[model samples]
Target: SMLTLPEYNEQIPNVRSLLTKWAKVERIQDVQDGLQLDVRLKTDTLLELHIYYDHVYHVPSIKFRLWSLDTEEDISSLRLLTLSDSELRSILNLGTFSVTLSTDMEMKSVYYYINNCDTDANVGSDVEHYLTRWISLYIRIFDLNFVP
Candidate 1:
């Protein structure tokens, strides 16, 4: 018996809208900084990764992974912070910065680099580390179910 699946494209808009709404600005209690501020996602279901420490002569780039609810795993989108150095500087309001991840399965990691964009390796390594940190952290932060 051949089974035909229903069209999925029709649901994309609603899904996007819901994700956009769900991923709204929320308060984060940072034990280290002891400060609070408003943050909004730059893209659909994607939030800005801010750096805790003040940096100079560098910029911040981040990556993210969108986990699937049904699978309880990272089965969907995987995004990287590929913005250029000048773009990052202009956008994030910093020259040097980094990111840390609170992840699923009780795991955590940190990623960062000085975004000089002057040399090839320096830029590449920083970008890689920054993005790696983002994915690891993203998994940790939201993996826990808060619905009681």
Candidate 2:
């Protein structure tokens, strides 16, 4: 149907989606920040949000601090969220063995967690590691709640 074609209102996968789709994103400045795509949601019938952020070395952790935008009579919020814990295995033990067993620089790990990695190691200089490639996203309906 013609509707399947590119619709003006339909959310397209540009720099916007790329920004919010991933948390610990880096080298995405060209697609998100460098172009200054902080937020690009427009007022329309459809609801969507395209947020972007800067990325640091390695797969950065997801962390956020809550603050009140309202000033007058702002109420403090608190709720007992359930807490749980389970033993976790190291990346190596999990079979995510990032060891640079190869001397070829091209075979380096996607994310070089170590800074100033050795070029002469089995896996030479993992500087060019692509951290985003290892990102495992968990998208849900709430993710799209940030609508315009």
Candidate 3:
């Protein structure tokens, strides 16, 4: 079943649904500061998804660390949600994956959240679209053979 996002408060649920649909959660560590999710992207690939507060802006940020299961080495990392669409597209090589943002809000607002604290800001459609596309891209990329 598809998930629904409310008109005003849709950020957390939306992110959670996307993660649940695309990646296999291995470990979920919720600390006083933030959350850390260790997931297996592929049989040979591992990654850590960090959701933490950016003290400067007081906004939550998401980042991914790509790792090798065989050598137990960190390969590459990406702060995907902060990149532009075209840049991410280049990294993914012209639509390698098929997931898309199912929201229709024009994504005028971007949000970041923790337990009781949340932050949001008005962003341009371009920024919103970049994030929307990255959400799908990151998950699909993890499913592929590319390690770097």
lDDT of 1 by residue, 1-148 (tens): 0101111122223222322333343534222321222233343333333322222323322333221123236464534334444543333333234433334464332223323233223323334333233222222332222110
Off by over 4 Å in 2: 1-17, 20-58, 73-142, 145-148
Candidate 2 residue-wise lDDT at 103: 23
Best of the candidates, TM-score: 3
Backbone clashes counted, model 3? 0
lDDT for 122 in candidate 1 is 37
Among the numbered candidates, top lDDT falls to 3
Give me the overall lDDT of model 3. Answer: 0.41
Worst 10 residues of 2 by lDDT: 83-92
Candidate 2 similarity to native, TM-score: 0.20
Q: TM-score for each prediction?
A: 0.24, 0.20, 0.39
* Candidate 3 local lDDT, 39-62, one digit each (tens): 765556555665544555444445
Worst lDDT run of 10 residues, candidate 3, spans 1-10
